[PDB]
């Protein structure tokens, strides 16, 4: 497949980028300068100079220039385009109305002129990768710009992007639940299918799964670089049932306005407790429908299974990919949703799960990653729009949201358009 | 000389046609850079019903491969038949459909119809008598239904003189692989139950069947199964290609196969198919064969055998032969298996026997079945495409391209027709 | 013997005359340094066509190089074969033109006209009977289109009866080269449209769409696109050279091709053309030839062929060739492209055949065209000379070297006519 | 082609000279002391001693001793010849009257005696090149006189001229408004057509482009040789669509007084820069036609493109040129005038540009040069005139000029000439 274009925005969505470029250069062995030194179609995500030389096809924004800072001095310097580490002045300070209106506005024409460019040089481009913190100043405001700029210039295209979805028990800001809504309103209508994780969800994974009793940061990234990789195997590798970028909004968006599946992975295991596991499809393919394995605290049990995608990665058969599904649909324990007989959407590629140096996770020759769009989620909405109202209700942090060029009207219409999104969850959860 | 043009659409599409430009070279001994190499003269004889000579000891097969997304036909271009074929068939796009009926039909699929039409004309220019047709696709698939009804469509009106064969893989029942399946497969027979003569029904869940019990292949692939399908493909063709004592070619099997108009759906079966194991147990014998083809369990449809009834069945056979014991097992089988067949027609088989095998086989027959039990194929399909579209699941997607939600209607009640045909042909006179 | 002098001025004039001796003394076997080389007798036979011979054991083209700048043929001296050439024919000015007809033509070309004729009249006292000329410009161009006309208007007075070719460079219609096309086409047609006999339209445009598609030709330069027009312009005297079961010379092709004599603008074919890569799955056969000369991706011209309809053809076959395959694909052309035809012309085919194919090629054929589809050429020329004219957007550089306004508007009225009887003849009887 | 003529007055010029000659010397693998040490057509600037010498073909001119004696004094002090170095005795201190009727008029006939002596050693001059500063005493006042001196002289010849125009934010002294309106009314008429840069375009490019932090009036010389090179490019060497330089004003000049072209240049990157980008001749194409890389401040954006001329440069394509210029027209953000449906005159050589031993600019085998007659000028016409009535509408600086030979009805006479130029900018900007 053709050309996909990435884009990193805030500290959580830089952060996540690098851990994913890292990937990226290993899996088709370009070297951290910039010179491939060990799969042809890497040009999905790489261009080149014509001087053997690849420049990585992202664009990273943000409001500071630390996190940023850090790219240009790290190892990875020499690979991006200098001019593609676009940085502000001052950071949006966790507020939404400086990300979109105040601060935000001003660097906005810059990224866009940038991506402008990047898709003169395509060929073709199925779509854009965009990585952010569903909470967060600059992961919030200046994200939605970028949506509602590049749904008008170019539309007609997919639009991914990977959010880090607040924790229902964990958080580290204060008025998350202000900034998480005020990005839902806005970036709705202009997302294709915004894939969630929390911080707390893979805490546990790697508390339960791997052995790792001090995770960082640095170790979720890893473990959330696979998962766009997953997702991007088809464009970038070969093998049986490929999934271009655009089969997965139609099969996982039954309606406009229900765009949010969840990320699960499988296996996650240290490099000892391996040699005790076959590993055989059946066991990860029980593993990634289990509550304990995915990366969302929502309870899957709770709600009922709209559509999933298995991307089968690895030494795998087709054979035994087909018996382990229909092992899960006769399970009583899942259910699925009547109006939708069929769910399943299978892709296999043959590329095994790269191999970090100095990870946490093992060597594995067969590796799947699920996406499923579940009415479980509609619970941990309804949590986060109940922090907003109990806030809300008394002005808790609104005046510095008023000063920075967002009105109050606002607020009350982005939590009616939540109120609405709960109510199409229940809608479509029910059936004669 | 008869002569047939092959076009491949899909991811599905190509990959069966991969491997089965490997089985047709194999029997007429083409090298894969494409000098020929045979041991026998036979086989050159016909050569040019599937390629267009080339000057220089080289052939050149007359296909056509679309593809939306390049990224299925590089696969081909790197495989060993690769090269095999002229780079100028090699049609492609840009934006690969996202499994979408509408998109591989009418936004997409429309700019790129009429460059695979100007190589499809040429190719039958080429040609001294052309006969008909053959498209591998997927009706699950969006390429394929949605760019392969196009094309059917297309050239079915441009050549309506001409035949088409279809050998479309259907949804299984139990496992499936696209989510809008049912979308794709009710649109797509919408046009091929009016455009096409005869389509072969195939689905991936009988075939797993097959080679878990009747083959016991432990870690069965892809390039296995199609393996199986183009042996099925190449049988079909097979008299139009070497001799016999009692040749059929794809009209004759239509007429004989195609009662009716709109029941033009068979199901393919193959014989023999024993394992390595079971290699020295068995006999290759005709008495054997006959009782394979027509068991449930060797027929690559889903839908049981048993459940309907055979209004026709056609039965190819190769290898030296013995034409009294040919009559003698159909006969059996007409005698034995009493009420699997309509009484309205007094014969249901429809016999071909060709001198050469396939492959090192010393023997080999090709199943097909035009039975009233794939009704339970298609009513499934309703019911899962009625579910869908009875709260709009997945159609705005399908909307949006430009696609009606009228259209969608008529394709469910053309659906529900070729249904009650099946039920009403399934009664007796008395 | 039949005998041609070559005259080429202007930039594109020069370096497409300089890539096209670079091909005649190829198909003669004449070495750059001027010695024959050739490996059969029949190339001396008609050698004296384009050469004047040297006693010495070598060879002199009898070719005429006109530009008002040196830089031009400076360049030519310093090429592969720019010794081959007389010294003396190498005629310049100091001040180049700028790309205005008028200094071209009235100011700075006039001084230097009588150093050309003399020049040309040595060429033709040289010779033992002058068959006609032929000119290689641009129209686009200042030097050529107004250099090039002031020496055709001199040579038709002084030779009335001989013919002149002339293989002129069109504007594209996308992408052009000068600012000042629209004057400087419109000046030079209005000399050429009553002074020449036949007229060869190129276009870099449809040259550049052959190279990327037609021929897969990566990274094309002048270098080859003049090698494709040396091709056509080669194959044009095919016949004066060498011998040919039906022989068509100069004037039997411009009876044949002009029907009346303002209609004498063609449009040039070439056949085969295929990429390296290709080469391996097409057979070259009569029956190819014909489709891809009559393709109108094949011509040489931006203006679609589809668009209008054929007064005349003619087609000029090389290489060892079956006359009843040449009649068989010309009529399945005048049968199947049964609205490309004009119906007041019953027969529209001149076919010519010749014994010597070019280069390596087994196999070679030139397609030329009198099509009623060049009218939206000078149409749009038409288009752009009034816009710019409307409010006289560069005529200050022509009125100042003494071009007055109303020789503009007469060019202008005597375009619009060409073009109306160019729909005149579009018509039907019935 | 034959010779060119050069002309350097005024500090401007002639410190633009000494720039233009380090590159033509370079070129052509000219010493710095006048001897060829390591492309025979070098004739068109140089002249040949006949024994192993070549004296550049210029006429350095100036008021004062100061910018010339520092080239009599610099590594170039053996290259040209003495009697070129012309100078006088005081400058014409910023003051229009001195340079044209006091002190010019004292030095002009040397000036003419030289430039007669190079014109008989011409066996073809095509024309001359005048560098000067559009707002300055001896750049504006003593050009006036070359160019009716010139034009009377020899007329009927191209006559190109470099002018400084400008900047309409930055500016070095107080009365350029009435400087530079006095040179554009006497040099309009013999003038074929003058190209125009700023220094703040420069300077920003300088900034932007390049990674220059400490630029100086020497970097922006020799970002401007580059820009002379190119356009006399067709005249010293070989390639398809030579541009001769009466092609120039033919193409560029649809009306006698509308010859005041813009300049622009690409690409233009540092030597680290460089080896991120491909350069590929869509890319340098699509940036001649950006505001960011043209070398006068005024919007393109805002007015019309009426003519354009493409002097590519290097190891390019004639395909793809014209299918890069097929992308620009094309395009619906830039507009071209309706009257002139073909604007582009495409120009190819088969000389990649020199490397500057010391200079800010990275070495590219692929450059292109953008002149384009643009009609956004007439905006700096008007605030230039703007400044001009609002200065004479209270005899700001009159009385020094009046002193000077140089009556005030000329101050009327010529502003309403400005005044002309642009309603014939606002008649030729509009179609019916
Ligand atoms: N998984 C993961 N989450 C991160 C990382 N860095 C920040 N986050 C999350 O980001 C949330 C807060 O938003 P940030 O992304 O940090 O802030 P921002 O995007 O820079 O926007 P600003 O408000 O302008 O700073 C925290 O709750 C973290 O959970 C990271 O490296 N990995
Ligand atoms: N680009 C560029 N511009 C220069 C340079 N030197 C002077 N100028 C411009 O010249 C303008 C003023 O006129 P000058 O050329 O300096 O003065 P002059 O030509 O010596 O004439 P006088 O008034 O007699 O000094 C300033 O505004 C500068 O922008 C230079 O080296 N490069
Ligand atoms: N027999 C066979 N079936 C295949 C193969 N690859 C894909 N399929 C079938 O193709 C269907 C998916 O449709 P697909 O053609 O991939 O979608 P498309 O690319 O839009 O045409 C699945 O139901 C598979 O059963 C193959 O190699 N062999
Ligand atoms: N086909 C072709 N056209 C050319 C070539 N060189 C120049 N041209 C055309 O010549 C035109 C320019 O006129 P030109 O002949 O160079 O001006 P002149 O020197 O005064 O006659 C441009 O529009 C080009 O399209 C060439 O090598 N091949
Ligand atoms: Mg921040
Ligand atoms: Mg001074």
Known sequence: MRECLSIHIGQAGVQMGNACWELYCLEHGIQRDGIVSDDSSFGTFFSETGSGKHVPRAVFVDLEQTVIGEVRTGPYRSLFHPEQLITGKEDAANNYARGHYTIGKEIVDTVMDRVRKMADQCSGLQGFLIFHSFGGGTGSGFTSLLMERLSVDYGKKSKLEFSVYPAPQISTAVVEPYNSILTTHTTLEHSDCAFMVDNEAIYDICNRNLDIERPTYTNLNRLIGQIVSSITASLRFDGALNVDLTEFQTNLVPYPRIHFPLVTYSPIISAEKAYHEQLSVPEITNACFEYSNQMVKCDPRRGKYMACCLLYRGDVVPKDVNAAIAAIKTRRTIQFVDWCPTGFKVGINYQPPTVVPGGDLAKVQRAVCMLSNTTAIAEAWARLDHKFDLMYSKRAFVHWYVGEGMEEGEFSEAREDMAALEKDYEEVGTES | ?430
């Open chain 2, 1 to 430: 000389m008869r002569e047939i043009v092959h076009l491949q659409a899909g991811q599905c599409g190509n990959q069966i046609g991969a491997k089965f430009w490997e089985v047709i070279s194999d029997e007429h001994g083409i090298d894969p850079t494409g000098t020929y190499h045979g041991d026998s003269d036979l086989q050159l004889e016909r050569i040019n019903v599937y390629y267009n000579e080339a000057t220089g000891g080289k052939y050149v097969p007359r296909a056509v491969l679309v593809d939306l997304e390049p990224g299925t036909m590089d696969s081909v271009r790197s495989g060993p038949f690769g090269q095999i074929f002229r780079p100028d068939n090699f049609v492609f796009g840009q934006s690969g459909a996202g499994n979408n009926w509408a998109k591989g039909h009418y936004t997409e699929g429309a700019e790129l119809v009429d460059s695979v039409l100007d190589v499809v004309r040429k190719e039958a220019e080429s040609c001294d008598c052309l006969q008909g047709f053959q498209l591998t696709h997927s009706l699950g698939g969006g390429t394929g239904s949605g760019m392969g009804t196009l094309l059917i469509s297309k050239i079915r009106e441009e050549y309506p003189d001409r035949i088409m064969n279809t050998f479309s893989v259907v949804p299984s029942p139990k496992v499936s692989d696209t989510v809008v399946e049912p979308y794709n497969a009710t649109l797509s027979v919408h046009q091929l139950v009016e455009n096409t003569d005869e389509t072969y029904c195939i689905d991936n869940e009988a075939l797993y069947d097959i080679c878990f019990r009747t083959l016991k292949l432990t870690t069965p692939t892809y390039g296995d199964l199609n393996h199986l399908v183009s042996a099925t493909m190449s049988g079909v063709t097979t008299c139009l290609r070497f001799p016999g004592q009692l040749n059929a070619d794809l009209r004759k099997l239509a007429v004989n196969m195609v009662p009716f108009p709109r029941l033009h759906f068979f199901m393919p079966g193959f014989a023999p198919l024993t394992s390595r194991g079971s290699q020295q147990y068995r006999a290759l014998t005709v008495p054997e064969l006959t009782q394979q083809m027509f068991d449930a369990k060797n027929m690559m449809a889903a839908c049981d055998p048993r459940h309907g009834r055979y209004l026709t069945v056609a039965a190819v056979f190769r290898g030296r032969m013995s034409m009294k014991e040919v009559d003698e097992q159909m006969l059996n089988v007409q005698n034995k298996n009493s009420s699997y067949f309509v009484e309205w027609i007094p014969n249901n088989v429809k016999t071909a026997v060709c001198d050469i095998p396939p492959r090192g086989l010393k023997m080999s027959a090709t199943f097909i079945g035009n039975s009233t039990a794939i009704q339970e194929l298609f009513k499934r399909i309703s019911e899962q495409f009625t579910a869908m579209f009875r709260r709009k699941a997945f159609l705005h997607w399908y909307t949006g391209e430009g696609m009606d939600e009228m259209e969608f209607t008529e394709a469910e009640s053309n659906m529900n027709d070729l249904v009650s045909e099946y039920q009403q042909y399934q009664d007796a006179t008395a």
